[PDB]
Structures are given as C-alpha cells and as structure tokens.
Design a protein around this ligand. Structure first.
Ligand SMILES: *Cc1c(COP(=O)(O)O)cnc(C)c1O
Ligand SMILES: *Cc1c(COP(=O)(O)O)cnc(C)c1O
Ligand SMILES: [Cl-]
Ligand SMILES: [Cl-]
Lengths: 405, 405
C-alpha cells in the first residue's frame, strides 16, 4: 500500500511556509514538486561526473554519454516503447509538439488536407497546428465538447475523411481532468490513414501509459510535471515515422557533415532532433524521477490519487455556490468557480491561507470560451497531497464565500 | 590578485579520479565544470522555492517569476545591455542562432540577398544560414582564413555590398582561440545597413563583454560554458530589432490570446520567444554562475588565463613534431596535432593519463578542411587549470611521441 507520509517526507518544499502559514501546494498540474532523490541525482552528477556528451574521447565524456543514453532507455521502458531510439529529448511538451508540426507536418500536410484537434486542448496542442494549416493551406477541425467536459464523439463522422492527415488529442485535460478514449479514437484515425499525436503531459504521472497498446504515432510529456527537473521533455515517435522525418529547420538539427561547397547532411533520428549541447543535468534528473515514480508504483499512485479525488469531490459538495467543471471521473485536477467572484480573487484569498491553486485561462482559452467564463480556479490533487489539505481548501472556500458573498 | 587554489576548491569535480589517476580537465571549451555555488543555488531553489512561473497568483509562483526576471536583469548588466528586456532565455547558443535565422531571417532576407559568415564558424553559426539562404534564395558568402588562423580582412570589399543583410561572426574561435575584430567589422557592416549577429559562446568567460560598445545587433552565449548549468543560453537583441521580430514558427512562441475562430495573437518580446515552461532550474543556476564569475572579476580571470596560456605555449615548444593551429595571441584553447598520429589516438593516450582533451572536428569542419586535416586535438586552459596540469599535458605528449613515433 501507498503511504503518503513516507512520500511527503521525500519532498523538502512541502515543509515550506507561505504568508506565515504551512504550504498546501495544490498546483502540481502547472508543475510538480521534486523529491530529494531527483534534486540530489542532478547535483551529484554536477559534483562528480560532469562533462560534455558527444561521445567524446575522454572518460567523463564517455561516461556521461552513457548516462544519458541509459536515461533514454529507461524512459522508453517507462512508456513501453519498442525501442529507446523512438524517444527524442526535447525542451518540453510545447517544443515537442512544435517539432512534430514543423518536421513531420511540413512534409505530410498539403493544401486541401485537414487536421483534427479537440476543443479542450492546451494551447501547445493548438497553435502549432493553426500555423501549419496557414503555411500549407490546410483546414483545422475541432472536436467539440459536451457540458460535462467530455468530447462529442458523435461529431467524428463529420470531421474524419480521406484528407485527414493527423489527429492531435490530449490524453488527460489539464483543466477538466477528462481522460479521453485514445485507443478507440486511434483505431478510427488509422482507418483513414491519419496519424495521431497524443499530448500526454497530464497523463504520465497518474497511471501507467503504454504507447504500444495505445498504438499512437506520437506521444509527448514534460519532465517537470513528472516530479522531475525543468527544461526536459520526452517525445516518442514510431520508428518508421521518425526515420522518415526531415531535419528540424526551425529548432536546429544535429549534422553528420557540414561543407561550404557541398552542403550539409544530418545524423540519424533520435539524435537528429537533439541539436547543440543537450540538457544533461535535466536528463539525469528526469531519470531519477522515473526511478522514484516506478519505485512507488503508478498503480499505487493512481489508487491513492483516486481516493483523494473522491474525498475532495464529496467534501466540496458542502461549499455553497461552487460551480465545478468537468466529469465526475476526473484525474488530478478540479476546475471550479465560486459564485460570481472572479477566479483571481478566490485564488488570492486561498493563497492568503497558504493554499496554492492556479487561476486564469490555464492555456486553454477555447475551453474557457466554451463554458462562457474568462477564467477558472484549478486545484491539483497529486500523490503527496493529503485529506487535511483538501479540508483546508474546503474551509477556505467556505470562508471566502461568507466574507465576499 | 587571483588565487587558483581558492578557485579550484570551489569545484568538486576537480577532486575526481579518472583511470585511477587525478583528473586534469582540459576540455572546458566543450563544457565548463561548475562551482558548488552554482550547483547548490539550483538545488536550493528546488528544495525551498520551486513553482511554475507565469506570474501565477500564489506566492511561490510570484516569487519564482521574480527570481527569473532578476536573473534576466543580472545577465543584461553582465553584458552591458541597455535593458533587461533585450535578453531572451534560450536552450543554448545553437537554439539562439536558429531563432534569429527563422524569426528575423525569414522576414529580412529575400531572394537575391547575401549573408556573410566566416570560415572558422562553429556549425551552429553556419547551418541555420545555409538553410535560410536555401529557403529564400539568397547567397551565403564566406570570409576566408589566413594560415595563422585569422580572418582575411582584405576580402571584405568583395563580400559586402548593398544586398548584404547580415554578418554572422564568431567572437572567439572555439578551435583556434582567435579573437575577431568585432567593433571594426560591425562598423563596416552597418555602413551597408547589414545587421551583425555575434556568436559569443567562447568569449563571455574570458574577459568583459560590452554589447553597447560593440554595437552588435545580436549576441549569443551558452550557460554551460560559463560555469553554469546545462539547458540555458542567452540571446541579446537590440530592442528596436527585437520588438519587430515575428513569432517563432519553428520553436514555438508564447500567446497573448488563442481563438479557434479569430486566430492567435502573441505577447511582447523577450517573452514572445520563451514558449512553454522555462528552464527555471537552469535560469537560477545561470544567475549564480554570473555572480560567481563577477565576484572573481573577469579582468582577474583574463590575466590568470593569459599567463597560463603563455606558460603552456612556451612549454609546448619542447614537444617534438607538435603542430599548433591558430595565432600566438589565442584565448582559452590550444588546437594541435602530434606528428602523423591521428588526433583520436593522441586523445586516448592523454585520457589514459587522466588528461581530458577533446578530439575530432569540433563542429568546425570547414575550418578542419582549410587546414587539410580531418581532426585536431584541443586543450582548454580555463581559470581553474594549473601550471602543473600544463606540465602533465607536455610530458604526456612527449611520452606519446616516443611510444608511437
Ligand atoms: C503544461 C502542459 C503543456 C505544456 O507543457 P510545457 O512543459 O510547458 O512545455 C501541454 N499540454 C498539457 C496538457 C499541459 O498540461
Ligand atoms: C559550443 C559552441 C556553440 C554551440 O553551443 P551550444 O551550447 O552547444 O548550443 C556555438 N558556437 C561556439 C563558438 C561554441 O563554442
Ligand atoms: Cl498559453
Ligand atoms: Cl556539429
């Protein structure tokens, strides 16, 4: 069984005080706190084994190159990719999606084609496709939402056709906590020869993820949401696709040869898309984060978080004039507004009690617009959050409602 | 005065053993070791103040946003930019140059124009321009080299004309240690209305850099070469230029608004070019690295390194059949080959003695080709290297020459 007290003791930030009160960090969906196992792994690398990593001749460089490729292997096993060489290190989910849209998009999406996104997508999974569609003259289609925060799947027959090149879809909504039916949607997309990119930035920390079972063509996620360092993400691409992708004009690609007369050639994928000095510190920390999470067990984490979520939704029923957004079976986040008060004011009061939530449009303005609100509040309930922190959130909202209503 | 023993005691890697022998790290031009002040600043941030940073409502987020903007201010003072808002955080020098070539290049370089690079450029300051020139149908012109590793300045009249849009030039060669006459070249470029991008990745750790005095239009450098963390670089752009640059299609740009019907708008520069979650860990560490280097004083560092370089070049005269490449007044690096032996073999023997040098083409294949060699060895002499490590290098080359000659 999972022991939240043993886990919390690994996270030094959770001791912190904010406004003279004990921190209740409910904003892990924006970024997760990191255990000392992650922080110290990165520091230890800088302290005892740091070097540049392009299979340099000397020992530190060779050993650091091997550390980085072992992390690539560990990450591929974490998401059950067939091969470590199907994983590209990227700056984060945002850059990973941009890479696909520029390298794969520019040579597979032509004038008259269409791309399907959903109305709940984070901006990082909208804007690259908007721009691509403008470049090549294709059409961006949108799966609409239901009031309960799920996709209107009945609209799919009107969106998928033979010119559909790509479905770009979120695994788990960063606002609603909706988990989308990826395996079925991927079957539909592949029946039309469409690829699927899955934005998995909110999924990989909540339960096991198996890209072979899903059969998705691309999958992205962010280190810093996975209790890991900033500046590092993972992009998975099916080997047959990845080995056809051209070099990344926009972000830089690693060369095989450079000639002023004869031009330039490029090294094989993965590494083709990792130009310049990689973020070795971040890669080391990401590896430690994958080990930490695997050691707790994602199924134990999921069971604890689901129980915590069920407790919170039950307790929140006693908050007057609370509006919740999203389905009952949400993962990780609770999106809400309190009566007619602006989310910004609710979040400031909650911060005044030492409760960290996020306010605003959460990089999902089309989602905001669907619900005809400018902003919502969002509380994250991660593996190190407690029933007691849920009770502070509930009491906090009750007090805010009396003081301001 | 500078005390190399007091400085070395700040760097924990320098205690390390390699192949059972004490490390002599002479590969700082590939990446620098980091002091504990840098390592611990990053760890301390993760331990006590970590949060997401997009001016979030709650305290940790607000305080982390302010930490990151103070580092931007500190970096702008470090290079004497007029305004902190002229600095963009980037993944590294490679990504910074790609950003300029894609955002500024695509809307200022048209068919029939030309760009001037030099023959000693690192690949990161060649390939983006090669691709841009192919996109828009412009011409890539090259300032050639002299045998001593300096630019043939007499060729400039034949390269600069009214269609010259940009000069992209290295401040200090990562292979030869040549320092280029930037201020004079920038005057010439501006007489034709050409902009200048300076690749300063090898300059910022060796002496003060003043972008107002230089009057360059762009300037880039890498954190990890500045005794700082990986995954972070600085791109400086003159405010009038930067505020005109369009969003970065290839790498992602931060939105002001996203609408599925009305399209997308973008936030003001700096931040326009920092999409997704920034590398907050790396930014914090970079700030500590700038403080550490400022506390030693760049002029003291320069005086120590110059003395160390002069000692090494004097000692190396006693190595039979040593070929050196570059001018006598080189900064930081010594590029060399030993008789007819492949650089790879020399580097392996040196590594066997615990001496870390770099071998290969050093991401400067046109430079290699100018000298009609496939590879060279390169020893870096940074601020924490000693006369004794120079003596190990010299003795090592002498032994290699007897064993293999
Ligand atoms: C946060 C998030 C992103 C963006 O991730 P970055 O690490 O900031 O690049 C994209 N999609 C979802 C669903 C997210 O939650
Ligand atoms: C190392 C270096 C680069 C590339 O820097 P990255 O940090 O790897 O992106 C570019 N130019 C010069 C002169 C360099 O030494
Ligand atoms: Cl956004
Ligand atoms: Cl290269």
């Amino acid at each position: 069984i999972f022991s939240v007290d043993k886990v919390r003791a690994d996270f030094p930030v959770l001791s912190r005080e904010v406004n003279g009160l004990p921190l209740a960090y409910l904003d892990s969906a924006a970024s997760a706190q990191k255990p000392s196992q992650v922080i110290d792994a990165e520091a230890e690398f800088y302290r005892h084994g740091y070097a540049a990593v392009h299979r340099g001749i000397h020992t530190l460089s060779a050993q650091a190159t091997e550390k980085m490729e072992n992390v690539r292997k560990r990450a591929s096993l974490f998401i059950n990719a067939r091969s470590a060489e199907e994983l590209v290190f990227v700056r984060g989910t945002t850059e990973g999606i941009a890479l696909v849209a520029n390298s794969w998009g520019n040579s597979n999406v032509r004038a008259g084609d269409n791309i399907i996104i959903s109305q709940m997508e984070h901006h990082a999974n909208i804007v690259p496709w908007q721009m691509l569609c403008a470049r090549v003259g294709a059409e961006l289609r949108v799966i609409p939402l239901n009031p309960d925060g799920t996709l209107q799947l009945e609209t799919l027959p009107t969106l998928f056709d033979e010119k559909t090149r790509l479905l770009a879809i979120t695994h788990v909504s960063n606002v609603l906590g909706t988990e989308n039916p990826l395996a079925e949607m991927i079957t539909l997309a592949h029946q039309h020869g469409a690829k699927v990119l899955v934005d998995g930035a909110q999924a990989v920390m909540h339960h096991p993820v198996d890209v072979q079972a899903l059969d998705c063509d691309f999958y992205v996620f962010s280190g810093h949401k996975l209790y890991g360092p900033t500046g590092i993400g993972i992009l998975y691409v099916k080997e047959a696709l990845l080995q056809e992708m051209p070099p990344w004009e926009g972000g830089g690609s690693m060369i095989a040869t450079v000639s002023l007369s004869e031009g330039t050639t490029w090294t094989k994928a993965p590494w083709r898309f990792e130009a310049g000095t990689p973020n070795t510190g971040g890669i080391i920390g990401l590896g430690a984060a994958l080990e930490y999470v695997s050691a707790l067990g994602l199924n134990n984490i999921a069971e604890y978080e689901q129980n915590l979520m069920h407790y919170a939704l039950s307790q929140l029923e006693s908050v007057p004039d609370l509006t919740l957004y999203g389905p009952q079976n949400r993962l990780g986040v609770i999106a809400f507004n309190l009566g007619k008060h602006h989310a910004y004011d609710v979040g400031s009061f909650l911060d005044n009690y030492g409760i960290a939530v996020r306010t605003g449009h959460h990089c999902a303005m089309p989602l905001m617009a669907y619900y005809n609100v400018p902003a919502m509040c969002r509380a994250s309930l991660a593996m190190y959050n407690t029933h007691e922190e849920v009770d502070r959130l509930v009491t906090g909202l009750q007090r805010i409602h009396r003081l301001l209503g």
